[PDB]
Amino acid sequence: MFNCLGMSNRDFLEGVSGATWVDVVLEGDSCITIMAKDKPTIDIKMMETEATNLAEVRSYCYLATVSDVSTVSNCPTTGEAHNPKRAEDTYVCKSGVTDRGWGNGCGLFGKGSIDTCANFTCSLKAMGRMIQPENVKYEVGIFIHGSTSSDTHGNYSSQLGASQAGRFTITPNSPAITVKMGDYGEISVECEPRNGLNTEAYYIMSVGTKHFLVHREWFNDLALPWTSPASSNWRNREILLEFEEPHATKQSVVALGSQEGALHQALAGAVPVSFSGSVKLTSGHLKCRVKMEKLTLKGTTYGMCTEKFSFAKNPADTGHGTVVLELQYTGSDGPCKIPISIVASLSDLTPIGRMVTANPYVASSEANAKVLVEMEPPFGDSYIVVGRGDKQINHHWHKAGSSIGKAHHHH
Amino acid sequence: MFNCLGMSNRDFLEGVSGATWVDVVLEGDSCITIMAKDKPTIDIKMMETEATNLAEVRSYCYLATVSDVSTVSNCPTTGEAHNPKRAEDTYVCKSGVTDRGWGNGCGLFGKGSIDTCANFTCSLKAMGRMIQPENVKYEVGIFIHGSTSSDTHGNYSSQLGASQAGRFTITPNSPAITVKMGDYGEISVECEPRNGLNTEAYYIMSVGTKHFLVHREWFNDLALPWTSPASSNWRNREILLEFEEPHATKQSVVALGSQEGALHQALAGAVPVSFSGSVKLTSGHLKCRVKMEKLTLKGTTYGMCTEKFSFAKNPADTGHGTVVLELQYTGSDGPCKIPISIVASLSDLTPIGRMVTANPYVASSEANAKVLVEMEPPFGDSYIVVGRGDKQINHHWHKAGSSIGKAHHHH
């Protein structure tokens, strides 16, 4: 979707009289319709958020195995013990003093030395990757409620071609942007990413079959053996190793148990992510100020359409307290403004309610044009009326509800 | 090998005065010579460890492919979507709600339903098998250092026939055993398998061309799709599947990437094994207590041999600080005890050193018998002397080393 219509995850905001900005929250899967006095209605929504060229920060080991454990030992006065496995970098080595005597095969009594080494291999590891702010693009779609039909309204190519839709990019570095709006002037947008979209606060951690957005502080403080992205030999290998109390000529080295369970429990709350090479960020939101003082209706204005209309599609409930319909216009006098309104009584034509599709018009000079119109009728019974006199058509509508005030369940 | 001689992987233990047991570690490829006061010297070693009738525990999938992905979709009020592929068990199916409207071909606006299915096939799997304790035999060989020759010493048939060798089985269920020792009384042996021989701690995992001894806890916690040995349809197939965000009438289903690399890295430390139908366990060891209070020299004792000896084989270094030789006896007065000793000087015949082949004797009544003798000479110069007076033969020996104490490199 590049527009608000048809979406269930949709909100409506008002640009009230005199307001020069509207504050919005843009989620990955939602859409905002903004209606404002003497301005075209506009939709704004997040289209996509992608981050390219993730860089490794560090990898941690959460299950180690030990192998090839050996101890070199020397009786007192016979020199210090050195384990030759000290040459091989995958071995962790530990020097020690031992009590020696006749009983343990040494002629003299006193301190002997030992040097025990053991081969370190990581069984299970988790990688952390980071996102550079210069490699993040937040794609935002804008739609202007100009003339559309049921066929053209959700067609991006058609809307882009009528200068009624477009796509702009917001970045962590360039969070402000002025977007031209065809014949409607321009808007200015400034956003701040929050939660899952504030990539400065997180790393992507790959564990097992999954990838997770994880808080940087927690990842950095993980007390596990680790490797740098370059020069990969495990550091702090001693965590997960237990050098047991040594005997005179031998020493046992055992791996600690797996920390995988503790890891999974740490990741239970975290948002899973997919394909960390060009990751798609779904969670979180942008907090944006849409400045609209230069958003304007079109300088070229029209007269009213004079010929007759019919309902090409009868009013339908959108689920949002609004109704949408499609008119077909017989006249060839376009472009022209559509004489459509909502009234309480066919005997009293005072307009009530509100048009979502503000200033509806036929765009085409050709006959039989189709125009979609979305409107908010009042609570109770009303009539959608198009035209006047003996060209008038109308359709009754009933909207459930009251003005007392809606309960909400915000998430 | 059923005996210690000729092996490089050999250790010597002492049954000291008053000790009623000796504690030993039996590895798959090593041998222990035990010398003890007023007892025959004995060898003890692991002969084989085999496990029969392994049973499958579970199999895991570490690379899945998806195929025949399809979605059935329904507009609002038109009923719930059901995918008929829900009948076929190899399909994973996922129900969903979608936003519907004119734009996506539905007359009414509201929630439509979808039902997407996809065929699951495992590309690469690993099987885990378990060993019942009742199907494990640890075979242990015992040799008594009775009279032998260079020809008979390593001949099992000859040694079994002289009641100087035998083979007994230790099992996880029956880890204790009393073994008769011919005319030497008996010993009692009790063992505990450790590491690679403690089959209660492991499963055999078949991956690719290889089989590995793997820790049970790690295998059981593997978060991959799995099948029971019976009723084989994959469970937890959803791991390795990604149902992508659905469009109105379509939904993409993709397999996750292979977990083979993570698997190989998990198996890098593990001990490889061969032929898991009757697997041979090589790695690990038995920790055994050899009780020897009823081990005894033979009740039938001999006088000294009176006739002359010659060296059929000159003393040879075994590599263990011991020397082995072969005498040939001219006399027909056997069986008789051999008058052999180690001395510092031919002018002073005080015995020094130690006989590995304790109480050497000629077993045969026939002439020209050959008797192997292994002995530990002191550091420095010494003489091996056989016989007395003008029947005396001797051979000088030099042993490098000192009594200060040997450095060791235990593994």
mmCIF file of N, CA, C and O in Angstrom, chain A residues 341-398:
data_model
loop_
_atom_site.group_PDB
_atom_site.id
_atom_site.type_symbol
_atom_site.label_atom_id
_atom_site.label_comp_id
_atom_site.label_asym_id
_atom_site.label_seq_id
_atom_site.Cartn_x
_atom_site.Cartn_y
_atom_site.Cartn_z
ATOM 1 N N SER A 341 -22.746 16.347 -1.192
ATOM 2 C CA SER A 341 -22.845 16.758 0.196
ATOM 3 C C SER A 341 -23.585 15.682 0.967
ATOM 4 O O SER A 341 -24.136 14.741 0.395
ATOM 5 N N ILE A 342 -23.554 15.829 2.285
ATOM 6 C CA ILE A 342 -24.279 14.991 3.230
ATOM 7 C C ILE A 342 -25.270 15.892 3.942
ATOM 8 O O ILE A 342 -24.888 16.966 4.411
ATOM 9 N N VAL A 343 -26.527 15.450 4.044
ATOM 10 C CA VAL A 343 -27.584 16.241 4.670
ATOM 11 C C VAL A 343 -28.378 15.370 5.639
ATOM 12 O O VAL A 343 -28.373 14.141 5.557
ATOM 13 N N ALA A 344 -29.052 16.030 6.587
ATOM 14 C CA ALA A 344 -29.913 15.309 7.516
ATOM 15 C C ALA A 344 -31.231 14.920 6.866
ATOM 16 O O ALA A 344 -31.766 13.841 7.140
ATOM 17 N N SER A 345 -31.774 15.789 6.014
ATOM 18 C CA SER A 345 -33.082 15.568 5.422
ATOM 19 C C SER A 345 -33.040 16.003 3.974
ATOM 20 O O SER A 345 -32.362 16.975 3.626
ATOM 21 N N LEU A 346 -33.744 15.263 3.131
ATOM 22 C CA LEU A 346 -33.899 15.723 1.763
ATOM 23 C C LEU A 346 -34.731 16.998 1.665
ATOM 24 O O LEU A 346 -34.739 17.626 0.599
ATOM 25 N N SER A 347 -35.363 17.396 2.759
ATOM 26 C CA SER A 347 -36.131 18.617 2.802
ATOM 27 C C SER A 347 -35.315 19.748 3.325
ATOM 28 O O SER A 347 -35.758 20.838 3.336
ATOM 29 N N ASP A 348 -34.133 19.467 3.819
ATOM 30 C CA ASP A 348 -33.257 20.507 4.302
ATOM 31 C C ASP A 348 -31.878 20.124 3.852
ATOM 32 O O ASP A 348 -31.302 19.229 4.385
ATOM 33 N N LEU A 349 -31.328 20.846 2.920
ATOM 34 C CA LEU A 349 -30.067 20.497 2.352
ATOM 35 C C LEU A 349 -28.852 21.129 2.939
ATOM 36 O O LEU A 349 -27.894 21.259 2.273
ATOM 37 N N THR A 350 -28.929 21.493 4.196
ATOM 38 C CA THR A 350 -27.799 22.099 4.832
ATOM 39 C C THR A 350 -26.735 21.041 5.012
ATOM 40 O O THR A 350 -26.977 20.014 5.582
ATOM 41 N N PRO A 351 -25.505 21.365 4.470
ATOM 42 C CA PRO A 351 -24.491 20.332 4.596
ATOM 43 C C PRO A 351 -24.042 20.052 5.988
ATOM 44 O O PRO A 351 -23.879 20.929 6.773
ATOM 45 N N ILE A 352 -23.828 18.789 6.251
ATOM 46 C CA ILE A 352 -23.335 18.335 7.511
ATOM 47 C C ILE A 352 -22.291 17.290 7.190
ATOM 48 O O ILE A 352 -22.073 16.994 6.057
ATOM 49 N N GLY A 353 -21.618 16.791 8.198
ATOM 50 C CA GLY A 353 -20.620 15.791 7.981
ATOM 51 C C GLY A 353 -19.407 16.400 7.359
ATOM 52 O O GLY A 353 -19.273 17.581 7.337
ATOM 53 N N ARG A 354 -18.549 15.566 6.816
ATOM 54 C CA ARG A 354 -17.260 16.016 6.311
ATOM 55 C C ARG A 354 -16.798 15.147 5.141
ATOM 56 O O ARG A 354 -16.983 13.926 5.157
ATOM 57 N N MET A 355 -16.117 15.749 4.197
ATOM 58 C CA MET A 355 -15.580 15.013 3.113
ATOM 59 C C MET A 355 -14.146 14.650 3.437
ATOM 60 O O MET A 355 -13.375 15.473 3.831
ATOM 61 N N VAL A 356 -13.830 13.385 3.339
ATOM 62 C CA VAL A 356 -12.488 12.947 3.466
ATOM 63 C C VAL A 356 -11.752 13.318 2.185
ATOM 64 O O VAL A 356 -10.692 13.838 2.228
ATOM 65 N N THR A 357 -12.387 13.058 1.055
ATOM 66 C CA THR A 357 -11.886 13.406 -0.259
ATOM 67 C C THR A 357 -12.344 14.843 -0.432
ATOM 68 O O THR A 357 -13.378 15.115 -0.958
ATOM 69 N N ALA A 358 -11.547 15.754 0.062
ATOM 70 C CA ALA A 358 -11.874 17.147 0.034
ATOM 71 C C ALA A 358 -11.922 17.716 -1.358
ATOM 72 O O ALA A 358 -11.137 17.366 -2.165
ATOM 73 N N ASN A 359 -12.875 18.599 -1.585
ATOM 74 C CA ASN A 359 -13.024 19.252 -2.859
ATOM 75 C C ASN A 359 -13.072 18.252 -4.013
ATOM 76 O O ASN A 359 -12.305 18.332 -4.895
ATOM 77 N N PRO A 360 -14.039 17.267 -3.917
ATOM 78 C CA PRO A 360 -14.047 16.285 -5.008
ATOM 79 C C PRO A 360 -14.304 16.858 -6.384
ATOM 80 O O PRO A 360 -15.126 17.723 -6.512
ATOM 81 N N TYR A 361 -13.602 16.346 -7.388
ATOM 82 C CA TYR A 361 -13.767 16.883 -8.730
ATOM 83 C C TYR A 361 -13.572 15.795 -9.783
ATOM 84 O O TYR A 361 -12.927 14.765 -9.553
ATOM 85 N N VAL A 362 -14.161 16.049 -10.946
ATOM 86 C CA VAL A 362 -13.878 15.283 -12.151
ATOM 87 C C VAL A 362 -12.622 15.861 -12.772
ATOM 88 O O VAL A 362 -12.548 17.067 -13.017
ATOM 89 N N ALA A 363 -11.617 15.020 -12.993
ATOM 90 C CA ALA A 363 -10.371 15.517 -13.552
ATOM 91 C C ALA A 363 -10.429 15.605 -15.060
ATOM 92 O O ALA A 363 -9.751 16.447 -15.657
ATOM 93 N N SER A 364 -11.245 14.763 -15.672
ATOM 94 C CA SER A 364 -11.185 14.514 -17.097
ATOM 95 C C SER A 364 -12.143 15.426 -17.846
ATOM 96 O O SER A 364 -13.225 15.768 -17.358
ATOM 97 N N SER A 365 -11.740 15.810 -19.054
ATOM 98 C CA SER A 365 -12.671 16.457 -19.961
ATOM 99 C C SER A 365 -13.574 15.455 -20.666
ATOM 100 O O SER A 365 -14.612 15.851 -21.205
ATOM 101 N N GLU A 366 -13.216 14.173 -20.664
ATOM 102 C CA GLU A 366 -14.004 13.177 -21.372
ATOM 103 C C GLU A 366 -15.177 12.703 -20.527
ATOM 104 O O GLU A 366 -15.167 12.804 -19.301
ATOM 105 N N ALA A 367 -16.191 12.165 -21.208
ATOM 106 C CA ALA A 367 -17.443 11.779 -20.570
ATOM 107 C C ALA A 367 -17.328 10.417 -19.891
ATOM 108 O O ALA A 367 -16.414 9.629 -20.155
ATOM 109 N N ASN A 368 -18.280 10.154 -18.989
ATOM 110 C CA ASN A 368 -18.366 8.900 -18.234
ATOM 111 C C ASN A 368 -17.164 8.694 -17.315
ATOM 112 O O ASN A 368 -16.757 7.562 -17.056
ATOM 113 N N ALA A 369 -16.592 9.779 -16.803
ATOM 114 C CA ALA A 369 -15.482 9.646 -15.869
ATOM 115 C C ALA A 369 -15.968 9.077 -14.546
ATOM 116 O O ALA A 369 -17.127 9.250 -14.161
ATOM 117 N N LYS A 370 -15.074 8.375 -13.847
ATOM 118 C CA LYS A 370 -15.396 7.814 -12.543
ATOM 119 C C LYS A 370 -14.568 8.491 -11.462
ATOM 120 O O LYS A 370 -13.359 8.689 -11.630
ATOM 121 N N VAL A 371 -15.226 8.858 -10.367
ATOM 122 C CA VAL A 371 -14.592 9.568 -9.264
ATOM 123 C C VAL A 371 -14.974 8.878 -7.958
ATOM 124 O O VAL A 371 -16.164 8.781 -7.616
ATOM 125 N N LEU A 372 -13.967 8.381 -7.248
ATOM 126 C CA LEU A 372 -14.132 7.873 -5.893
ATOM 127 C C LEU A 372 -14.261 9.038 -4.915
ATOM 128 O O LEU A 372 -13.565 10.054 -5.038
ATOM 129 N N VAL A 373 -15.149 8.884 -3.932
ATOM 130 C CA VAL A 373 -15.303 9.877 -2.870
ATOM 131 C C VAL A 373 -15.465 9.179 -1.528
ATOM 132 O O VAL A 373 -16.349 8.335 -1.356
ATOM 133 N N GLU A 374 -14.627 9.551 -0.571
ATOM 134 C CA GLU A 374 -14.716 9.069 0.799
ATOM 135 C C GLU A 374 -15.211 10.215 1.659
ATOM 136 O O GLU A 374 -14.777 11.353 1.477
ATOM 137 N N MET A 375 -16.114 9.918 2.591
ATOM 138 C CA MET A 375 -16.711 10.959 3.426
ATOM 139 C C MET A 375 -17.031 10.397 4.809
ATOM 140 O O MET A 375 -17.213 9.190 4.989
ATOM 141 N N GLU A 376 -17.091 11.299 5.785
ATOM 142 C CA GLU A 376 -17.461 10.941 7.148
ATOM 143 C C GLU A 376 -18.870 11.439 7.433
ATOM 144 O O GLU A 376 -19.076 12.657 7.593
ATOM 145 N N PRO A 377 -19.864 10.561 7.473
ATOM 146 C CA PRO A 377 -21.227 11.005 7.767
ATOM 147 C C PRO A 377 -21.419 11.185 9.262
ATOM 148 O O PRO A 377 -20.612 10.692 10.070
ATOM 149 N N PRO A 378 -22.448 11.916 9.683
ATOM 150 C CA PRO A 378 -22.682 12.066 11.120
ATOM 151 C C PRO A 378 -23.214 10.764 11.686
ATOM 152 O O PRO A 378 -23.614 9.850 10.958
ATOM 153 N N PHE A 379 -23.201 10.684 13.011
ATOM 154 C CA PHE A 379 -23.926 9.623 13.695
ATOM 155 C C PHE A 379 -25.407 9.692 13.335
ATOM 156 O O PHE A 379 -25.978 10.778 13.200
ATOM 157 N N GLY A 380 -26.028 8.530 13.157
ATOM 158 C CA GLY A 380 -27.448 8.501 12.857
ATOM 159 C C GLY A 380 -27.782 8.403 11.379
ATOM 160 O O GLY A 380 -26.982 7.900 10.589
ATOM 161 N N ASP A 381 -28.970 8.868 10.997
ATOM 162 C CA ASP A 381 -29.406 8.809 9.612
ATOM 163 C C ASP A 381 -28.980 10.060 8.855
ATOM 164 O O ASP A 381 -28.997 11.171 9.398
ATOM 165 N N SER A 382 -28.596 9.868 7.595
ATOM 166 C CA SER A 382 -28.261 10.990 6.734
ATOM 167 C C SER A 382 -28.468 10.568 5.292
ATOM 168 O O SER A 382 -28.787 9.411 4.999
ATOM 169 N N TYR A 383 -28.281 11.525 4.387
ATOM 170 C CA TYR A 383 -28.381 11.295 2.956
ATOM 171 C C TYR A 383 -27.133 11.830 2.287
ATOM 172 O O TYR A 383 -26.711 12.955 2.570
ATOM 173 N N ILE A 384 -26.550 11.020 1.414
ATOM 174 C CA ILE A 384 -25.556 11.481 0.456
ATOM 175 C C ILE A 384 -26.310 11.966 -0.772
ATOM 176 O O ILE A 384 -27.021 11.186 -1.409
ATOM 177 N N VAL A 385 -26.177 13.245 -1.105
ATOM 178 C CA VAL A 385 -26.908 13.816 -2.227
ATOM 179 C C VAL A 385 -25.907 14.386 -3.218
ATOM 180 O O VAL A 385 -24.965 15.087 -2.836
ATOM 181 N N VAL A 386 -26.133 14.086 -4.467
ATOM 182 C CA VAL A 386 -25.329 14.578 -5.535
ATOM 183 C C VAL A 386 -26.220 15.303 -6.528
ATOM 184 O O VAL A 386 -27.186 14.789 -6.956
ATOM 185 N N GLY A 387 -25.864 16.519 -6.850
ATOM 186 C CA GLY A 387 -26.626 17.288 -7.791
ATOM 187 C C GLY A 387 -27.824 18.010 -7.247
ATOM 188 O O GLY A 387 -28.152 17.914 -6.103
ATOM 189 N N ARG A 388 -28.483 18.748 -8.110
ATOM 190 C CA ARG A 388 -29.619 19.548 -7.710
ATOM 191 C C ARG A 388 -30.813 19.394 -8.593
ATOM 192 O O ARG A 388 -30.702 18.948 -9.699
ATOM 193 N N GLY A 389 -31.965 19.772 -8.087
ATOM 194 C CA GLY A 389 -33.147 19.695 -8.928
ATOM 195 C C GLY A 389 -33.421 18.289 -9.409
ATOM 196 O O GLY A 389 -33.310 17.313 -8.659
ATOM 197 N N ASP A 390 -33.772 18.172 -10.687
ATOM 198 C CA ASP A 390 -34.130 16.887 -11.275
ATOM 199 C C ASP A 390 -32.921 16.071 -11.725
ATOM 200 O O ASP A 390 -33.101 14.966 -12.253
ATOM 201 N N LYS A 391 -31.707 16.595 -11.559
ATOM 202 C CA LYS A 391 -30.489 15.808 -11.700
ATOM 203 C C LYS A 391 -30.057 15.179 -10.383
ATOM 204 O O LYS A 391 -29.061 14.448 -10.355
ATOM 205 N N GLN A 392 -30.790 15.431 -9.306
ATOM 206 C CA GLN A 392 -30.348 15.002 -7.991
ATOM 207 C C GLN A 392 -30.461 13.493 -7.857
ATOM 208 O O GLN A 392 -31.473 12.902 -8.240
ATOM 209 N N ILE A 393 -29.403 12.869 -7.327
ATOM 210 C CA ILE A 393 -29.468 11.502 -6.844
ATOM 211 C C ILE A 393 -29.123 11.539 -5.366
ATOM 212 O O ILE A 393 -28.475 12.466 -4.880
ATOM 213 N N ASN A 394 -29.573 10.528 -4.642
ATOM 214 C CA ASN A 394 -29.221 10.488 -3.234
ATOM 215 C C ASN A 394 -29.226 9.052 -2.751
ATOM 216 O O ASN A 394 -29.761 8.153 -3.402
ATOM 217 N N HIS A 395 -28.618 8.852 -1.585
ATOM 218 C CA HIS A 395 -28.501 7.529 -1.003
ATOM 219 C C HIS A 395 -28.563 7.701 0.501
ATOM 220 O O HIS A 395 -27.817 8.506 1.065
ATOM 221 N N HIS A 396 -29.481 6.990 1.139
ATOM 222 C CA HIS A 396 -29.594 7.074 2.579
ATOM 223 C C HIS A 396 -28.443 6.318 3.233
ATOM 224 O O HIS A 396 -27.927 5.339 2.690
ATOM 225 N N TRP A 397 -28.038 6.793 4.409
ATOM 226 C CA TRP A 397 -26.971 6.155 5.175
ATOM 227 C C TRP A 397 -27.305 6.237 6.658
ATOM 228 O O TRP A 397 -27.846 7.247 7.119
ATOM 229 N N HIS A 398 -27.010 5.160 7.389
ATOM 230 C CA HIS A 398 -27.122 5.131 8.843
ATOM 231 C C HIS A 398 -25.782 4.745 9.458
ATOM 232 O O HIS A 398 -25.190 3.722 9.083
#
